[PDB]
């Protein structure tokens, strides 16, 4: 509606409603440069989709997980984060903890997937 | 914690807990050789992901199915398979039956999707 990055300056609670607009624009000798550009775009897309798969978020744009939020990563209240801040500011604020969060998300799915298997193994 | 393929010599049970350790390592004129190698890496990844999709296992690493084990592919009990065998030995042991198993998995999903559709058609 607003455009490819039209919500980039909007608050997180507004920009989160345009996730399909950005998602649909991630896929689409001089031949070498053009092919490298296309292969790189594909590789980045697949890295993100694989990472979502590892976390159990495949096929979703808004994925709820079982990892608790640590107040040391960000001590802002939920209203302050979603009503008075943009995603660029948040991305900067949480940059130093992103890999920590990603590790926990992987661990969470690893435990959950085993737990699902055990629930399914009950007769 | 053992790294990529670190569990290769471990038992199947222990190795089943390290799937995410190596899953991340499947995506990551001289320009053509490197570019073709990158494209092949993508094609192999996508063929495996498509095959998981056909079986109804998309987005999961440990996917349980409705295909019974027929005891002719391998007649070992779970104790020997999971606690006294590695994945390389298992892969060799049932290599000749993997195409049979994959075919059954495809057929199982084909029936399941129709059943889900029929269940979803009830008011």
């Amino acid at each position, epitope marked *: 509606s607003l455009g490819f990055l039209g919500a980039a300056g909007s608050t997180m609670g507004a920009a989160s409603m345009t996730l399909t607009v950005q998602a649909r624009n991630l896929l689409s000798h001089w031949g070498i440069k053009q092919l490298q550009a296309r292969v790189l775009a594909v590789e980045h897309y697949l890295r993100d989709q694989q990472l979502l798969g590892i976390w159990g978020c495949s096929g979703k744009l808004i994925c709820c997980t079982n990892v608790p939020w640590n107040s040391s990563w960000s001590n802002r209240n939920l209203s302050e984060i979603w009503d008075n801040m943009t995603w660029l500011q948040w991305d900067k604020e949480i940059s130093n903890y992103t890999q920590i969060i990603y590790g926990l998300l992987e661990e969470s799915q690893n*435990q959950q997937e085993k*737990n699902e298997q055990d629930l399914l193994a*009950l007769d | 914690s053992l790294g990529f393929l670190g569990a290769a010599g471990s038992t199947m049970g222990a190795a089943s807990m390290t799937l995410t350790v190596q899953a991340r390592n499947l995506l990551s004129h001289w320009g053509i050789k490197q570019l073709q190698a990158r494209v092949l890496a993508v094609e192999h990844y996508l063929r495996d992901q498509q095959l998981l999709g056909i079986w109804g296992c998309s987005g999961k690493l440990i996917c349980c199915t409705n295909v019974p084990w027929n005891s002719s592919w391998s007649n070992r009990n779970l104790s020997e398979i999971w606690d006294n065998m590695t994945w390389l030995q298992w892969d060799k042991e049932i290599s000749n039956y993997t195409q049979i198993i994959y075919g059954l998995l495809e057929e199982s999903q084909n029936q399941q999707e129709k059943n889900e559709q029929d269940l979803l058609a009830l008011d």
Partner: antibody
Amino acid sequence: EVQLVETGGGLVQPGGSLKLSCRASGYTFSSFAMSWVRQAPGKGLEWVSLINDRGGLTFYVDSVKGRFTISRDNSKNTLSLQMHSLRDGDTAVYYCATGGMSSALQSSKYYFDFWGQGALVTVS
Amino acid sequence: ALTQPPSVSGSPGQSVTISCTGTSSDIGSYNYVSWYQQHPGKAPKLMIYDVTQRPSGVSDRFSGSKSGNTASLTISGLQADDEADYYCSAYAGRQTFYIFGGGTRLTVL
């Protein structure tokens, strides 16, 4: 030889709480499921709760589902049960038992392999 | 939730049958019925599991079977040391894990 020894408490007043703790030895603790089974002084056995080998999954009888918490510590090789809101109907000998579940890659059980000595829990 | 007689008896050295009657959702659907021997003052011991399979350490005098929704344990060669309260444990699915209803006092004459 496999041993399970309960080190829990005795008499608690109605509405209070009591924690039981079972010390396990003689086997790899993390390889087996654990459960609590109770027997009223004049009755037969009653299953109370079941915990998986990793501790991630717990199951209870409906009569205690909102009152008892079952947990494990696989580094100390102990099983704990925290019983809240104790009722007069909960007076029983509580036995620590090994078995009751298999973690998908193990052969099936659905039976209890080892039983502890049993702690006597009473409610005034 | 299982029905089991409160007591049985028989001559020493002879066979006695102890049985539990359940329903289709427990004894019937699942072949996971086990039998326990509880001597007074002691914790129950496992005698039979998976309906017919005895654990190591138990003699061949204890053997079970099932038919329909009824499971039974036959104890041959009754000894003076076999006086105990016997119980069934049926698996009744993921909603109702175990049913321990019962308790048969075995008297050896």
